[PDB]
PDB file of N, CA and C in Angstrom:
ATOM      1  N   UNK A   1     -17.482  -2.546  64.733  1.00 21.60           N
ATOM      2  CA  UNK A   1     -18.003  -1.150  64.690  1.00 21.60           C
ATOM      3  C   UNK A   1     -18.184  -0.580  66.087  1.00 21.60           C
ATOM      4  N   UNK A   2     -17.694   0.657  66.240  1.00 22.07           N
ATOM      5  CA  UNK A   2     -17.592   1.362  67.524  1.00 22.07           C
ATOM      6  C   UNK A   2     -18.862   1.478  68.379  1.00 22.07           C
ATOM      7  N   UNK A   3     -20.015   1.709  67.778  1.00 19.73           N
ATOM      8  CA  UNK A   3     -21.217   1.878  68.599  1.00 19.73           C
ATOM      9  C   UNK A   3     -21.807   0.526  69.012  1.00 19.73           C
ATOM     10  N   UNK A   4     -21.138  -0.547  68.572  1.00 21.27           N
ATOM     11  CA  UNK A   4     -21.575  -1.925  68.812  1.00 21.27           C
ATOM     12  C   UNK A   4     -20.655  -2.706  69.739  1.00 21.27           C
ATOM     13  N   UNK A   5     -19.681  -2.066  70.385  1.00 23.66           N
ATOM     14  CA  UNK A   5     -18.911  -2.752  71.437  1.00 23.66           C
ATOM     15  C   UNK A   5     -19.695  -2.709  72.754  1.00 23.66           C
ATOM     16  N   UNK A   6     -19.356  -3.559  73.713  1.00 25.19           N
ATOM     17  CA  UNK A   6     -20.132  -3.594  74.945  1.00 25.19           C
ATOM     18  C   UNK A   6     -19.866  -2.338  75.755  1.00 25.19           C
ATOM     19  N   UNK A   7     -20.859  -1.939  76.556  1.00 23.90           N
ATOM     20  CA  UNK A   7     -20.818  -0.682  77.330  1.00 23.90           C
ATOM     21  C   UNK A   7     -19.544  -0.471  78.112  1.00 23.90           C
ATOM     22  N   UNK A   8     -19.078  -1.507  78.834  1.00 23.84           N
ATOM     23  CA  UNK A   8     -17.795  -1.385  79.513  1.00 23.84           C
ATOM     24  C   UNK A   8     -16.666  -0.941  78.575  1.00 23.84           C
ATOM     25  N   UNK A   9     -16.634  -1.465  77.352  1.00 25.78           N
ATOM     26  CA  UNK A   9     -15.539  -1.135  76.452  1.00 25.78           C
ATOM     27  C   UNK A   9     -15.655   0.316  76.036  1.00 25.78           C
ATOM     28  N   UNK A  10     -16.803   0.646  75.458  1.00 22.07           N
ATOM     29  CA  UNK A  10     -17.084   1.971  74.993  1.00 22.07           C
ATOM     30  C   UNK A  10     -16.925   3.002  76.122  1.00 22.07           C
ATOM     31  N   UNK A  11     -17.568   2.754  77.263  1.00 20.42           N
ATOM     32  CA  UNK A  11     -17.465   3.612  78.445  1.00 20.42           C
ATOM     33  C   UNK A  11     -15.997   3.769  78.869  1.00 20.42           C
ATOM     34  N   UNK A  12     -15.262   2.662  78.913  1.00 18.16           N
ATOM     35  CA  UNK A  12     -13.853   2.695  79.288  1.00 18.16           C
ATOM     36  C   UNK A  12     -13.055   3.548  78.301  1.00 18.16           C
ATOM     37  N   UNK A  13     -13.245   3.293  77.007  1.00 16.00           N
ATOM     38  CA  UNK A  13     -12.593   4.049  75.947  1.00 16.00           C
ATOM     39  C   UNK A  13     -12.921   5.561  75.963  1.00 16.00           C
ATOM     40  N   UNK A  14     -14.135   5.929  76.378  1.00 14.11           N
ATOM     41  CA  UNK A  14     -14.557   7.306  76.245  1.00 14.11           C
ATOM     42  C   UNK A  14     -13.925   8.203  77.308  1.00 14.11           C
ATOM     43  N   UNK A  15     -13.884   7.724  78.553  1.00 14.76           N
ATOM     44  CA  UNK A  15     -13.320   8.490  79.668  1.00 14.76           C
ATOM     45  C   UNK A  15     -11.814   8.630  79.567  1.00 14.76           C
ATOM     46  N   UNK A  16     -11.166   7.645  78.949  1.00 13.98           N
ATOM     47  CA  UNK A  16      -9.731   7.712  78.714  1.00 13.98           C
ATOM     48  C   UNK A  16      -9.451   8.813  77.704  1.00 13.98           C
ATOM     49  N   UNK A  17     -10.320   8.918  76.703  1.00 15.06           N
ATOM     50  CA  UNK A  17     -10.276  10.019  75.743  1.00 15.06           C
ATOM     51  C   UNK A  17     -10.654  11.377  76.383  1.00 15.06           C
ATOM     52  N   UNK A  18     -11.596  11.366  77.332  1.00 14.79           N
ATOM     53  CA  UNK A  18     -11.959  12.549  78.126  1.00 14.79           C
ATOM     54  C   UNK A  18     -10.813  13.110  78.978  1.00 14.79           C
ATOM     55  N   UNK A  19      -9.571  12.707  78.678  1.00 12.80           N
ATOM     56  CA  UNK A  19      -8.359  13.310  79.280  1.00 12.80           C
ATOM     57  C   UNK A  19      -7.127  13.234  78.354  1.00 12.80           C
ATOM     58  N   UNK A  20      -6.733  14.382  77.783  1.00  7.76           N
ATOM     59  CA  UNK A  20      -5.752  14.455  76.680  1.00  7.76           C
ATOM     60  C   UNK A  20      -5.673  15.839  76.008  1.00  7.76           C
ATOM     61  N   UNK A  21      -6.749  14.180  72.263  1.00 11.55           N
ATOM     62  CA  UNK A  21      -8.109  14.554  72.676  1.00 11.55           C
ATOM     63  C   UNK A  21      -9.206  14.265  71.660  1.00 11.55           C
ATOM     64  N   UNK A  22     -10.459  14.401  72.066  1.00 13.54           N
ATOM     65  CA  UNK A  22     -11.547  14.064  71.153  1.00 13.54           C
ATOM     66  C   UNK A  22     -11.739  15.069  70.021  1.00 13.54           C
ATOM     67  N   UNK A  23     -11.340  16.335  70.206  1.00 13.16           N
ATOM     68  CA  UNK A  23     -11.444  17.291  69.098  1.00 13.16           C
ATOM     69  C   UNK A  23     -10.347  17.050  68.081  1.00 13.16           C
ATOM     70  N   UNK A  24      -9.202  16.584  68.552  1.00 13.07           N
ATOM     71  CA  UNK A  24      -8.112  16.303  67.644  1.00 13.07           C
ATOM     72  C   UNK A  24      -8.496  15.061  66.844  1.00 13.07           C
ATOM     73  N   UNK A  25      -8.917  14.009  67.556  1.00 16.31           N
ATOM     74  CA  UNK A  25      -9.413  12.780  66.940  1.00 16.31           C
ATOM     75  C   UNK A  25     -10.441  13.101  65.885  1.00 16.31           C
ATOM     76  N   UNK A  26     -11.508  13.770  66.312  1.00 14.01           N
ATOM     77  CA  UNK A  26     -12.601  14.160  65.433  1.00 14.01           C
ATOM     78  C   UNK A  26     -12.055  14.945  64.243  1.00 14.01           C
ATOM     79  N   UNK A  27     -11.023  15.759  64.482  1.00 11.30           N
ATOM     80  CA  UNK A  27     -10.438  16.596  63.436  1.00 11.30           C
ATOM     81  C   UNK A  27      -9.623  15.784  62.433  1.00 11.30           C
ATOM     82  N   UNK A  28      -8.922  14.778  62.951  1.00 12.27           N
ATOM     83  CA  UNK A  28      -8.081  13.872  62.169  1.00 12.27           C
ATOM     84  C   UNK A  28      -8.907  12.981  61.220  1.00 12.27           C
ATOM     85  N   UNK A  29     -10.082  12.576  61.681  1.00 13.63           N
ATOM     86  CA  UNK A  29     -11.008  11.759  60.914  1.00 13.63           C
ATOM     87  C   UNK A  29     -12.052  12.665  60.216  1.00 13.63           C
ATOM     88  N   UNK A  30     -11.922  12.857  58.905  1.00 10.06           N
ATOM     89  CA  UNK A  30     -12.806  13.792  58.186  1.00 10.06           C
ATOM     90  C   UNK A  30     -12.082  14.998  57.615  1.00 10.06           C
ATOM     91  N   UNK A  31     -18.056  13.825  58.863  1.00  9.47           N
ATOM     92  CA  UNK A  31     -18.065  14.413  60.234  1.00  9.47           C
ATOM     93  C   UNK A  31     -17.801  15.933  60.229  1.00  9.47           C
ATOM     94  N   UNK A  32     -18.684  16.744  60.809  1.00  8.45           N
ATOM     95  CA  UNK A  32     -18.557  18.205  60.706  1.00  8.45           C
ATOM     96  C   UNK A  32     -18.683  18.917  62.040  1.00  8.45           C
ATOM     97  N   UNK A  33     -18.337  20.205  62.041  1.00  8.97           N
ATOM     98  CA  UNK A  33     -18.582  21.136  63.146  1.00  8.97           C
ATOM     99  C   UNK A  33     -19.885  20.885  63.860  1.00  8.97           C
ATOM    100  N   UNK A  34     -21.002  20.960  63.137  1.00  8.57           N
ATOM    101  CA  UNK A  34     -22.313  20.767  63.767  1.00  8.57           C
ATOM    102  C   UNK A  34     -22.526  19.341  64.304  1.00  8.57           C
ATOM    103  N   UNK A  35     -21.974  18.345  63.616  1.00 11.33           N
ATOM    104  CA  UNK A  35     -21.941  16.985  64.162  1.00 11.33           C
ATOM    105  C   UNK A  35     -21.255  16.991  65.535  1.00 11.33           C
ATOM    106  N   UNK A  36     -20.090  17.623  65.614  1.00 11.18           N
ATOM    107  CA  UNK A  36     -19.330  17.733  66.863  1.00 11.18           C
ATOM    108  C   UNK A  36     -20.041  18.511  67.988  1.00 11.18           C
ATOM    109  N   UNK A  37     -20.914  19.449  67.650  1.00 11.47           N
ATOM    110  CA  UNK A  37     -21.573  20.183  68.718  1.00 11.47           C
ATOM    111  C   UNK A  37     -22.439  19.282  69.593  1.00 11.47           C
ATOM    112  N   UNK A  38     -23.193  18.367  68.985  1.00 11.26           N
ATOM    113  CA  UNK A  38     -23.971  17.381  69.747  1.00 11.26           C
ATOM    114  C   UNK A  38     -23.113  16.807  70.867  1.00 11.26           C
ATOM    115  N   UNK A  39     -21.822  16.672  70.568  1.00  8.76           N
ATOM    116  CA  UNK A  39     -20.860  16.010  71.420  1.00  8.76           C
ATOM    117  C   UNK A  39     -20.310  16.949  72.474  1.00  8.76           C
ATOM    118  N   UNK A  40     -20.064  18.186  72.062  1.00 13.67           N
ATOM    119  CA  UNK A  40     -19.453  19.197  72.886  1.00 13.67           C
ATOM    120  C   UNK A  40     -20.359  19.541  74.055  1.00 13.67           C
ATOM    121  N   UNK A  41     -21.645  19.663  73.746  1.00 16.48           N
ATOM    122  CA  UNK A  41     -22.666  20.003  74.719  1.00 16.48           C
ATOM    123  C   UNK A  41     -22.986  18.886  75.719  1.00 16.48           C
ATOM    124  N   UNK A  42     -22.350  17.721  75.558  1.00 18.71           N
ATOM    125  CA  UNK A  42     -22.500  16.607  76.505  1.00 18.71           C
ATOM    126  C   UNK A  42     -22.010  16.984  77.907  1.00 18.71           C
ATOM    127  N   UNK A  43     -21.031  17.875  77.955  1.00 15.76           N
ATOM    128  CA  UNK A  43     -20.347  18.245  79.189  1.00 15.76           C
ATOM    129  C   UNK A  43     -21.291  18.933  80.183  1.00 15.76           C
ATOM    130  N   UNK A  44     -22.365  19.498  79.654  1.00 15.93           N
ATOM    131  CA  UNK A  44     -23.392  20.160  80.439  1.00 15.93           C
ATOM    132  C   UNK A  44     -24.160  19.186  81.315  1.00 15.93           C
ATOM    133  N   UNK A  45     -24.169  17.922  80.896  1.00 17.34           N
ATOM    134  CA  UNK A  45     -24.888  16.874  81.602  1.00 17.34           C
ATOM    135  C   UNK A  45     -23.962  16.368  82.687  1.00 17.34           C
ATOM    136  N   UNK A  46     -24.467  16.286  83.927  1.00 16.17           N
ATOM    137  CA  UNK A  46     -23.576  16.161  85.078  1.00 16.17           C
ATOM    138  C   UNK A  46     -22.440  15.135  84.900  1.00 16.17           C
ATOM    139  N   UNK A  47     -22.730  14.009  84.259  1.00 15.41           N
ATOM    140  CA  UNK A  47     -21.746  12.949  84.144  1.00 15.41           C
ATOM    141  C   UNK A  47     -21.259  12.791  82.699  1.00 15.41           C
ATOM    142  N   UNK A  48     -21.891  13.515  81.772  1.00 18.45           N
ATOM    143  CA  UNK A  48     -21.737  13.288  80.325  1.00 18.45           C
ATOM    144  C   UNK A  48     -20.347  13.387  79.714  1.00 18.45           C
ATOM    145  N   UNK A  49     -20.136  12.684  78.598  1.00 19.39           N
ATOM    146  CA  UNK A  49     -18.864  12.746  77.862  1.00 19.39           C
ATOM    147  C   UNK A  49     -19.012  12.907  76.348  1.00 19.39           C
ATOM    148  N   UNK A  50     -18.328  13.934  75.804  1.00 16.13           N
ATOM    149  CA  UNK A  50     -18.286  14.204  74.366  1.00 16.13           C
ATOM    150  C   UNK A  50     -17.581  13.083  73.596  1.00 16.13           C
ATOM    151  N   UNK A  51     -16.617  12.439  74.234  1.00 19.37           N
ATOM    152  CA  UNK A  51     -15.912  11.361  73.595  1.00 19.37           C
ATOM    153  C   UNK A  51     -16.882  10.207  73.346  1.00 19.37           C
ATOM    154  N   UNK A  52     -17.742   9.920  74.327  1.00 16.73           N
ATOM    155  CA  UNK A  52     -18.773   8.890  74.176  1.00 16.73           C
ATOM    156  C   UNK A  52     -19.643   9.233  73.001  1.00 16.73           C
ATOM    157  N   UNK A  53     -20.152  10.461  73.003  1.00 15.06           N
ATOM    158  CA  UNK A  53     -20.913  10.928  71.862  1.00 15.06           C
ATOM    159  C   UNK A  53     -20.072  10.722  70.577  1.00 15.06           C
ATOM    160  N   UNK A  54     -18.820  11.188  70.569  1.00 19.15           N
ATOM    161  CA  UNK A  54     -17.966  11.111  69.361  1.00 19.15           C
ATOM    162  C   UNK A  54     -17.713   9.682  68.817  1.00 19.15           C
ATOM    163  N   UNK A  55     -17.455   8.761  69.724  1.00 15.91           N
ATOM    164  CA  UNK A  55     -17.146   7.417  69.346  1.00 15.91           C
ATOM    165  C   UNK A  55     -18.397   6.746  68.761  1.00 15.91           C
ATOM    166  N   UNK A  56     -19.545   6.899  69.420  1.00 16.13           N
ATOM    167  CA  UNK A  56     -20.807   6.366  68.868  1.00 16.13           C
ATOM    168  C   UNK A  56     -21.075   6.944  67.483  1.00 16.13           C
ATOM    169  N   UNK A  57     -20.966   8.259  67.350  1.00 17.43           N
ATOM    170  CA  UNK A  57     -21.058   8.932  66.063  1.00 17.43           C
ATOM    171  C   UNK A  57     -20.072   8.334  65.060  1.00 17.43           C
ATOM    172  N   UNK A  58     -18.825   8.107  65.479  1.00 12.01           N
ATOM    173  CA  UNK A  58     -17.839   7.514  64.565  1.00 12.01           C
ATOM    174  C   UNK A  58     -18.234   6.093  64.195  1.00 12.01           C
ATOM    175  N   UNK A  59     -18.748   5.358  65.188  1.00 12.60           N
ATOM    176  CA  UNK A  59     -19.308   4.009  64.995  1.00 12.60           C
ATOM    177  C   UNK A  59     -20.358   3.953  63.891  1.00 12.60           C
ATOM    178  N   UNK A  60     -21.426   4.737  64.060  1.00 10.96           N
ATOM    179  CA  UNK A  60     -22.493   4.914  63.079  1.00 10.96           C
ATOM    180  C   UNK A  60     -21.958   5.193  61.663  1.00 10.96           C
ATOM    181  N   UNK A  61     -20.928   6.042  61.561  1.00 14.73           N
ATOM    182  CA  UNK A  61     -20.306   6.409  60.269  1.00 14.73           C
ATOM    183  C   UNK A  61     -19.506   5.264  59.655  1.00 14.73           C
ATOM    184  N   UNK A  62     -19.249   4.228  60.447  1.00 13.80           N
ATOM    185  CA  UNK A  62     -18.578   3.031  59.955  1.00 13.80           C
ATOM    186  C   UNK A  62     -17.176   2.744  60.462  1.00 13.80           C
ATOM    187  N   UNK A  63     -16.860   3.204  61.664  1.00 13.32           N
ATOM    188  CA  UNK A  63     -15.508   3.055  62.199  1.00 13.32           C
ATOM    189  C   UNK A  63     -15.405   1.785  63.047  1.00 13.32           C
ATOM    190  N   UNK A  64     -14.328   1.036  62.827  1.00  9.29           N
ATOM    191  CA  UNK A  64     -14.025  -0.152  63.601  1.00  9.29           C
ATOM    192  C   UNK A  64     -13.054   0.233  64.668  1.00  9.29           C
ATOM    193  N   UNK A  65     -12.791  -0.686  65.579  1.00 10.11           N
ATOM    194  CA  UNK A  65     -11.717  -0.505  66.545  1.00 10.11           C
ATOM    195  C   UNK A  65     -10.317  -0.502  65.895  1.00 10.11           C
ATOM    196  N   UNK A  66     -10.194  -1.026  64.686  1.00  6.32           N
ATOM    197  CA  UNK A  66      -8.900  -0.955  64.026  1.00  6.32           C
ATOM    198  C   UNK A  66      -8.719   0.339  63.270  1.00  6.32           C
ATOM    199  N   UNK A  67      -9.799   0.963  62.819  1.00  5.21           N
ATOM    200  CA  UNK A  67      -9.653   2.244  62.156  1.00  5.21           C
ATOM    201  C   UNK A  67      -9.345   3.297  63.200  1.00  5.21           C
ATOM    202  N   UNK A  68      -9.926   3.124  64.394  1.00  8.07           N
ATOM    203  CA  UNK A  68      -9.723   4.006  65.553  1.00  8.07           C
ATOM    204  C   UNK A  68      -8.251   4.051  65.942  1.00  8.07           C
ATOM    205  N   UNK A  69      -7.611   2.878  65.968  1.00  8.75           N
ATOM    206  CA  UNK A  69      -6.192   2.809  66.288  1.00  8.75           C
ATOM    207  C   UNK A  69      -5.352   3.488  65.220  1.00  8.75           C
ATOM    208  N   UNK A  70      -5.669   3.239  63.949  1.00  9.09           N
ATOM    209  CA  UNK A  70      -5.112   4.019  62.836  1.00  9.09           C
ATOM    210  C   UNK A  70      -5.118   5.529  63.078  1.00  9.09           C
ATOM    211  N   UNK A  71      -6.219   6.028  63.640  1.00  9.27           N
ATOM    212  CA  UNK A  71      -6.403   7.450  63.919  1.00  9.27           C
ATOM    213  C   UNK A  71      -5.591   7.928  65.113  1.00  9.27           C
ATOM    214  N   UNK A  72      -5.643   7.195  66.219  1.00  9.36           N
ATOM    215  CA  UNK A  72      -4.885   7.531  67.423  1.00  9.36           C
ATOM    216  C   UNK A  72      -3.373   7.471  67.235  1.00  9.36           C
ATOM    217  N   UNK A  73      -2.934   6.574  66.351  1.00  6.57           N
ATOM    218  CA  UNK A  73      -1.521   6.421  65.949  1.00  6.57           C
ATOM    219  C   UNK A  73      -1.070   7.642  65.164  1.00  6.57           C
ATOM    220  N   UNK A  74      -1.847   7.964  64.133  1.00  8.61           N
ATOM    221  CA  UNK A  74      -1.677   9.169  63.357  1.00  8.61           C
ATOM    222  C   UNK A  74      -1.697  10.398  64.265  1.00  8.61           C
ATOM    223  N   UNK A  75      -2.552  10.407  65.290  1.00 10.52           N
ATOM    224  CA  UNK A  75      -2.672  11.559  66.194  1.00 10.52           C
ATOM    225  C   UNK A  75      -1.337  11.760  66.913  1.00 10.52           C
ATOM    226  N   UNK A  76      -0.867  10.680  67.541  1.00 11.50           N
ATOM    227  CA  UNK A  76       0.469  10.606  68.127  1.00 11.50           C
ATOM    228  C   UNK A  76       1.577  11.028  67.146  1.00 11.50           C
ATOM    229  N   UNK A  77       1.557  10.489  65.935  1.00 11.84           N
ATOM    230  CA  UNK A  77       2.612  10.753  64.960  1.00 11.84           C
ATOM    231  C   UNK A  77       2.586  12.145  64.325  1.00 11.84           C
ATOM    232  N   UNK A  78       1.433  12.794  64.276  1.00  9.76           N
ATOM    233  CA  UNK A  78       1.397  14.172  63.778  1.00  9.76           C
ATOM    234  C   UNK A  78       1.635  15.215  64.876  1.00  9.76           C
ATOM    235  N   UNK A  79       1.465  14.826  66.145  1.00 10.09           N
ATOM    236  CA  UNK A  79       1.742  15.734  67.268  1.00 10.09           C
ATOM    237  C   UNK A  79       3.236  16.079  67.329  1.00 10.09           C
ATOM    238  N   UNK A  80       4.089  15.061  67.218  1.00  8.67           N
ATOM    239  CA  UNK A  80       5.523  15.267  67.098  1.00  8.67           C
ATOM    240  C   UNK A  80       5.884  15.968  65.815  1.00  8.67           C
ATOM    241  N   UNK A  81       5.477  15.441  64.665  1.00  9.42           N
ATOM    242  CA  UNK A  81       5.768  16.123  63.409  1.00  9.42           C
ATOM    243  C   UNK A  81       5.461  17.615  63.525  1.00  9.42           C
ATOM    244  N   UNK A  82       4.355  17.946  64.190  1.00 12.98           N
ATOM    245  CA  UNK A  82       3.980  19.343  64.440  1.00 12.98           C
ATOM    246  C   UNK A  82       5.008  20.037  65.342  1.00 12.98           C
ATOM    247  N   UNK A  83       5.279  19.429  66.493  1.00  8.55           N
ATOM    248  CA  UNK A  83       6.154  19.986  67.519  1.00  8.55           C
ATOM    249  C   UNK A  83       7.572  20.303  67.046  1.00  8.55           C
ATOM    250  N   UNK A  84       8.074  19.519  66.095  1.00  6.48           N
ATOM    251  CA  UNK A  84       9.362  19.757  65.459  1.00  6.48           C
ATOM    252  C   UNK A  84       9.259  20.502  64.125  1.00  6.48           C
ATOM    253  N   UNK A  85       8.162  21.206  63.877  1.00  6.17           N
ATOM    254  CA  UNK A  85       8.066  21.938  62.619  1.00  6.17           C
ATOM    255  C   UNK A  85       8.311  23.438  62.770  1.00  6.17           C
ATOM    256  N   UNK A  86       9.087  24.013  61.832  1.00  6.08           N
ATOM    257  CA  UNK A  86       9.406  25.435  61.833  1.00  6.08           C
ATOM    258  C   UNK A  86       8.276  26.246  61.212  1.00  6.08           C
TER     259      UNK A  86
END
C-alpha cells in the first residue's frame, strides 16, 4: 500500500510525478474534485507536492505499487490512443 512505503520511495515517486501527470493519474483512477484540491493547494507550501498528497491519498484508498503501475501504463497507453484519434 502506497502510504506505507518508506519515505525515500514515496518522496522519490512523488517528485518524478511532479514533472509530466498527477491530475491525469488522479483522473484515470476513479476519489473526487474536492479530494484533489487538498493536493492541488500543496504547491503553495514552499517545497510541497500534490503528487505526494495524491499518492498518500491513493494509498489510504487501497492502492498498491502494482495497481499504480497498472494506472501509469494505462496513462501511457491512452495518451497515444488519444493522440491518434479523429
